[PDB]
């Protein structure tokens with residue numbers, strides 16, 4: 096591959112030069128003959144595979160702390176070696192773990208919020224042994240990160256994978272989601288996306304309130320055991336009721352959302368170690384709720400009802416009635432959240448901040464991988480600066496990765 | 509391998525077999541994806557297999573593979589490349605190759621129309637004056653008094669690079685951009701440089717906001733020459749809003765005919781360096797990009813004024829609100845003037861049905877998500893949720909250098 100690749104911003108004519116792609120460790124799905132850039136998703140590591148992966152990460156860590164080739168660098172390397180050789184694995188020091196987590200976020204090509212990458216509270220839960228223990232650790236995460244509305248980004252890292260039969264997993268794809276219930280008549284109450292998961296919870300013994308906005312319990316799996324249900328204390332789940340600054344009727348829609356966005360289904364990869372339960376949280380970009388959660392057809396799908404209360408001509412599509420409502424909805428989302436002093440960023444601010452971030456990363460690190468398809472907001476795309484920004488996408492390690500759904504893989508005891 | 513593409517709204521899965529038939533690179537590799545890069549990066553021996561394969565797919569597409577018609581044609585092309593280092597397409601082959609370059613255009617959301625293409629063979633052309641006549645007839649035909657019709661005009665192929673036919677205008681119809689003293693820019697800032705080349709060539713500009721640039725036509729490697737399209741041929745739409753009576757007072761208008769004239773049509777290893785093609789507008793091209801891009805007409809702020817919007821924080825989404833109203837007015841104007849136009853909801857809806865057709869009958873449809881998804885209201889259109897595979901099928905429209913960077917006078 097060529098040593099320097101060039102990206103161009105077509106609005107400002109600014110050109111950036113990427114050398115960091117040279118450090119790419121994983122495949123993208125693309126080949127020279129086909130591009131998968133818009134495909135959403137394109138038993139354990141052996142001693143021989145583990146050795147070079149660990150060394151790679153160790154070198155990189157001591158390179159970050161400006162002690163490359165130092166006595167402590169060679170000593171850490173030999174210790175990790177000795178350990179992989181005797182135990183087929185090794186354990187990260189707390190410093191390495193925190194560095195690894197921060198960088199996994201730094202390398203997350205789909206995340207537009209990465210300007211904040213180095214401010215990340217890391218909770219080491221590697222001593223956890225039970226699901227009740229996971230529940231404790233998670234509750235602490237939530238209360239900390241929520242911070243009464245002034246959100247702070249946090250990750251909680253549970254023990255690494257060992258033999259594959261003793262995985263820690265959060266079954267919830269996100270820590271906080273609303274239930275979805277499928278009626279006999281074919282309609283769906285709640286959040287239709289979560290119908291399968293809700294069903295799982297119900298089977299496990301969850302008594303459903305059958306409402307539009309019922310917070311799902313946690314379904315926690317420790318040490319490869321069957322998962323266990325727990326209810327998050329409602330006092331720990333901060334929510335924002337949606338209202339509109341101009342339209343007083345908007346509040347009559349009975350809408351609300353949760354303040355804390357937190358992913359719990361991904362796998363954290365550091366130095367060849369796999370952390371299968373590593374829930375992380377930041378704060379919301381308005382469009383995530385106002386556009387996707389609310390306006391996707393297989394989600395809350397409120398465009399129609401909102402348009403009606405707006406007295407919009409809805410026979411032609413060229414009236415653009417869908418669009419007009421969308422903007423209002425997203426205004427009401429940012430307004431509710433700010434009025435309740437819960438941290439939220441609009442899509443203009445977030446994308447602007449990301450460009451400055453990207454530019455700085457090219458300047459200091461020789462590149463910044465980015466997935467244009469994910470980075471560009473799902474509304475008003477071209478009036479945000481990222482739309483006109485060329486981006487190279489490649490996978491750096493440490494990383495957050497996808498993993499199969501646990502209910503597809505679990506061997507029920 | 510057979511690849512699957514999933515729409516994440518309907519859960520429809522399509523199996524792509526077509527991609528196995530491609531041979532041009534996309535620029536990506538296993539480790540680096542360049543799907544958001546806009547411009548990623550012929551002898552007798554080179555030319556023949558290219559020629560061979562294309563004749564092969566033509567006789568395959570018309571169900572006469574192995575026929576004597578097929579055989580002779582293969583022998584005919586052989587002898588002609590042999591003795592002239594090039595070869596000439598049959599008319600039927602020209603029309604197929606044009607329609608199929610459109611069909612293979614991964615960046616075009618309009619492809620459901622691909623087989624309804626009017627093809628004007630201008631390969632007998634020899635002078636700029638010729639090109640100008642051919643182009644005027646194109647324009648008049650395709651405009652059709654508002655009921656637009658897809659057209660392409662194809663000039664003589666490349667032979668030796670030194671005798672290239674080129675339309676210097678990136679598009680057939682665009683407005684002039686003027687660089688003011690005070691540093692502001694009049695007209696369309698994107699054309700500023702070209703506008704000034706035209707002036708430097710003898711063009712007397714009216715220095716207004718919407719001045720139709722003249723045609724700059726290069727024939728057979730020669731210096732390009734200026735020609736003004738007759739005004740009566742250039743259909744234009746005044747932009748008014750249905751509810752906002754003040755919108756007319758913004759003084760906005762656009763041309764009704766979108767016609768790309770800077771690309772290269774490639775067929776059977778032949779290079780048609782001059783091949784303007786035209787269609788009709790999707791409303792967002794004008795309403796979003798042309799008008800609201802900071803580097804273009806940049807009307808967003810001015811519009812936001814007249815809507816009496818709070819423009820202090822971005823979180824008031826005032827830019828968004830003004831944008832939707834601009835695009836309503838555009839659609840509304842064209843429609844009121846019986847000028848053909850498609851809204852991005854219908855356009856994207858059409859593209860999805862087209863993808864179904866292509867998978868059903870052809871085993872896939874190359875598509876560039878970055879270009880297919882409209883520049884506004886992305887996820888409330890069907891294609892945002894549609895996985896698409898991009899790959900390069902031939903015949904194709906490729907980019908080419910700007911002529912004012914390679915032409916010797």
Ligand code: HEM
Pocket residue numbers: 196199200203205206207208209211215248249250358375376377378379380383440445469495
């Ligand atoms: C601090 C403020 C943050 C903001 C404003 C932000 C913003 C976003 C947005 C808008 C998305 C797209 C989400 C979607 O459409 O599903 C996203 C995705 C993502 N973010 Fe961030 N994020 C933040 C924090 C974090 C943190 C703390 C981490 C990890 C430590 C992270 C890693 C990721 C990853 C891995 C994805 C991909 C999600 C997926 O593949 O499903 N982000 N982020």
Ligand code: HEM
Pocket residue numbers: 606610613615616617618619621625658659660768785786787788789790793850855905
């Ligand atoms: C008939 C109705 C058509 C519609 C609604 C349509 C729609 C569009 C749109 C919206 C774009 C993006 C334009 C931009 O962002 O600059 C595009 C690109 C494109 N179209 Fe179509 N188009 C149509 C006809 C055609 C025809 C007749 C051809 C060729 C014979 C064609 C070939 C292409 C190509 C090659 C591109 C890529 C342009 C580039 O690379 O800059 N289209 N189309």
Ligand SMILES: Cc1cc(N)nc(CCc2cncc(CCCN(C)C)c2)c1
Pocket residue numbers: 269271272356357358375376377378379380383
């Ligand atoms: C760290 C982080 C920050 C942020 N702004 N958003 C996220 C994703 C938030 C999120 C919350 N509830 C539900 C979802 C579902 C997304 C569904 N996608 C994967 C199809 C996503 C994560």
Ligand SMILES: Cc1cc(N)nc(CCc2cncc(CCCN(C)C)c2)c1
Pocket residue numbers: 618679681682766767768785786787788789790793
């Ligand atoms: C065939 C065709 C159909 C269509 N609907 N749009 C187009 C684009 C036409 C077009 C007209 N004037 C100006 C432009 C500028 C494009 C600017 N891009 C290249 C940066 C483009 C072409």
Ligand SMILES: C[C@H](O)[C@H](O)[C@H]1CNc2nc(N)[nH]c(=O)c2N1
Pocket residue numbers: 133134135468469470516892893894895896
């Ligand atoms: C098909 C396509 O890849 C898919 O709909 C993507 C598009 N871009 C996205 N971007 C973000 N941030 N989140 C998403 O879920 C998606 N979905």
Ligand SMILES: C[C@H](O)[C@H](O)[C@H]1CNc2nc(N)[nH]c(=O)c2N1
Pocket residue numbers: 105482483484485486544545546878879880
């Ligand atoms: C950076 C990116 O490649 C560039 O801005 C592209 C994005 N998608 C686009 N899509 C269309 N239809 N037209 C464009 O000009 C662009 N520009």
Ligand SMILES: [Zn+2]
Pocket residue numbers: 125129130131132536540541542543
């Ligand atoms: Zn790619």
